[PDB]
Amino acid sequence: GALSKEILEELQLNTKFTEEELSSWYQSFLKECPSGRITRQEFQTIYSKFFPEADPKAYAQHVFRSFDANSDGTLDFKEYVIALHMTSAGKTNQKLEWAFSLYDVDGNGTISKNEVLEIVTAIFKMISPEDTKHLPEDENTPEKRAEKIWGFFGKKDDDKLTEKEFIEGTLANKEILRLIQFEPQKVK
Ligand SMILES: [Ca+2]
């Protein structure tokens, strides 16, 4: 097929390849995935291959789920391309609403204390133990990282974090941005 003028428009406001190039990638994608769909197991394998120093299965599953809040089924080429952009390219502040969808594990519209710990833990496993030693003491375990996040938002244990407030805080408080950071290369 051809990449629809519509998906190209979709992709080019959310990422950066070009129209023709995304078609080129698409034609190759179709050769390898004839149905134009990729399963969660297939998507996980991409992360397994390219993060040999890490244990990225949980992270990849959460990233996959951010495009349905469902684990079964598939992604299409558009979601697959956007997923790779989110994890690996561009600047974080252009990604804040997607970050919210990542952290809202159950997709119920708000973020809970446990959901922060789940995603923080998954991201934490993307970092080698070599790199883990260079992290500051008060931010070197998933529990410390996740509790610092929850405290930066002024939250009690049973509170619910809205998208409005998540965007505000990730924009304003650069310590929050550092702690919620989901691109493995940027978790320094
Ligand atoms: Ca939730």
Curated annotation (Swiss-Prot):
Changing residue 185 to A: Reduces inhibition of GRK1 activity. Changing residue 147 to A: No effect on calcium binding to EF-hand 2 and EF-hand 3 domains. No effect on interaction with GRK1. Changing residue 184 to G: Reduces interaction with GRK1. Ca(2+) 2 binds at residues 104, 106, 108, 110, 115. Ca(2+) 1 binds at residues 68, 70, 72, 74, 79. Its main location: other. Expressed in the retina (at protein level). Expressed in the pineal gland (at protein level). It is found in: Photoreceptor inner segment; Cell projection, Cilium, Photoreceptor outer segment; Photoreceptor outer segment membrane; Perikaryon. EF-hand 2 and EF-hand 3 domains are the low-affinity and the high-affinity calcium binding sites, respectively. EF-hand 1 and EF-hand 4 domains do not bind calcium due to substitutions that disrupt their respective Ca(2+) binding loops. The cooperative binding of calcium to the EF-hand 2 domain following EF-hand 3 domain calcium binding requires myristoylation. Calcium binding to the 2 EF-hand domains induces exposure of the myristoyl group through a protein conformation change, this process known as the calcium-myristoyl switch facilitates binding to photoreceptor cell membranes. This is Recoverin. It comes from Bos taurus. The gene is RCVRN.
